[PDB]
Design a protein around this ligand. Structure first.
Ligand code: SIA
Ligand code: SIA
Ligand code: SIA
Ligand code: CA
Length: 401
């Protein structure tokens, strides 16, 4: 697959890759490096609930390469600005973090987790992540000029902001390449249309264009509470398509290749409301599970994990239950046990990792979208070791390649 940044998954992971696990726990930052030694290493005495007073409801914590060396850094949008702990290359990070910009923060700019979105993204092909925020006035960017130097925030576009009516309980915003030039464009599921704003590569986005009159709360009755939507390449040309988990099942609108979109089609009669899928019980993902390197469908359902494989053109094979685990029936809960679909083995076919009640578990893809047995990774970064959704943040992330 390709680099798409979403609200649900603001830290993209590489296909192929051997993703690491990163936890912002009470006591600070801990990593599990993907390797022959599986252990938890504490790396930063900060960015934690107790270590610095970091709060899920006030602050944002991400990973991103802010230097251009393909190593991920820790990035926190704190009370009064943006703090970065850079990767030292050896499973250590700079501590204390450095405050790079007095903006995009609770008390510097009036940023609110419940109103605004903050990402890091290399928006100008410099190799380094710029700060990008969907704020009040529109989209703001702080340019990453290297050496830890971030420029004062500049308005990238006067759209997709709270002022323009954008709401986290109604609407969705993504960064994804819809043209194939490698620049991440805005894709926004608004009140009545899906819009794109083309990335000009210079810290600005072009005027919004409506591309589809569906997939929205006011067009087709798509709600945040029942009908998740994603953007992902379903054909293998590196250009992002639209995919929605609706009522009858999965609908898509395919990119024509130039960032305009096709008609909306029902392509699979599963993974929707009518087949019993529920945002409160289940996790629904699109990731590459095969050597076709396109978006396949993965659902963590009741009885286990279900998969429908993309034929390579956005049509799908039959739904198969591939693992009898990680499901609601096995006690896995959306509010307690983070589950990710990411490559942990370097073959290009995404695997499964789940932060369970007692242990972190993984289940590896055989290379063809079928899976091996469940494997216990470590007894840490779990509910029973004091990690909750309300006080901790957990990601899969490529710290290195
Ligand atoms: C959340 C958010 O967007 N904050 C931004 C605000 C709002 O757009 C305006 O306060 C809307 O009135 O504008 C700034 O120029 C500012 O005043 O500091 C930049 C800041 O980062
Ligand atoms: C959330 C959302 O879709 N906002 C869009 C709105 C709404 O469609 C109107 O509020 C409907 O009346 O219209 C705009 O032209 C605007 O206000 O600049 C574009 C903006 O992106
Ligand atoms: C969420 C969802 O599945 N929406 C689907 C809707 C709704 O079923 C009806 O609009 C509700 O009355 O039906 C469509 O034909 C439409 O109107 O666009 C396709 C769309 O994908
Ligand atoms: Ca794999």
């Amino acid at each position: 697959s390709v680099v798409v940044i979403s609200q649900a998954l603001p830290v993209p992971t590489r296909i192929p890759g051997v993703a690491d696990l990163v936890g912002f726990g009470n006591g600070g930052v801990y990593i599990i490096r993907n390797s022959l030694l599986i252990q938890v290493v504490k790396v930063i005495n900060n960015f934690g609930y107790d270590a610095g007073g970091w709060r899920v409801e006030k602050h944002v914590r991400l990973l991103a390469d802010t230097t251009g060396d393909n190593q991920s850094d820790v990035v926190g949008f704190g009370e009064n600005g943006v703090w970065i702990s850079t990767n030292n290359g050896n499973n250590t990070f700079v501590d204390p973090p450095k405050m790079v910009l007095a903006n995009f923060a609770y008390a510097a700019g009036g940023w609110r987790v419940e109103k605004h979105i903050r990402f890091m993204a290399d928006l100008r092909k410099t190799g380094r992540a710029d700060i990008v925020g969907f704020g009040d006035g529109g989209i703001y960017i702080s340019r990453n000029n290297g050496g830890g130097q971030f420029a004062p925030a500049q308005l990238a576009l006067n759209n997709f902001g709270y002022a323009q009516g954008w709401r986290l309980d109604r609407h969705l915003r993504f960064l994804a390449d819809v043209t194939g030039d490698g620049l991440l464009d805005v894709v926004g599921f608004g009140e009545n249309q899906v819009y794109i704003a083309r990335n000009s590569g210079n810290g600005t986005f072009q005027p919004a264009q409506a591309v589809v009159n569906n997939f929205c709360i006011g067009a087709g009755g798509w709600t945040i509470s029942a009908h998740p939507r994603v953007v992902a390449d379903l054909t293998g040309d590196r250009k992002a398509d639209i995919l929605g988990f609706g009522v009858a099942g999965v609908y898509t609108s395919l990119n024509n290749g130039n960032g305009t979109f096709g008609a909306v089609n029902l392509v699979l009669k599963d993974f929707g409301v009518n087949s019993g899928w529920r945002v409160e019980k289940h996790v629904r993902c699109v990731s590459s599970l095969t050597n076709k390197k396109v978006g396949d469908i993965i659902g963590f359902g009741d009885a286990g994990v279900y998969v429908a494989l993309n034929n390579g053109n956005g049509t799908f094979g039959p739904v198969k239950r591939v693992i009898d685990n990680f499901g609601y029936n096995q006690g896995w809960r959306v509010d307690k046990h983070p589950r990710f679909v990411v490559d942990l083995t370097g073959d290009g076919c995404a695997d499964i990792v789940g932060f369970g009640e007692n242990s972190v578990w993984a289940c590896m893809n055989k290379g063809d979208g079928t899976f091996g047995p469940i494997m216990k990774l470590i007894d840490d970064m779990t509910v029973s070791k004091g990690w909750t959704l309300q006080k901790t943040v957990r990601y899969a992330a490529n710290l290195y390649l």
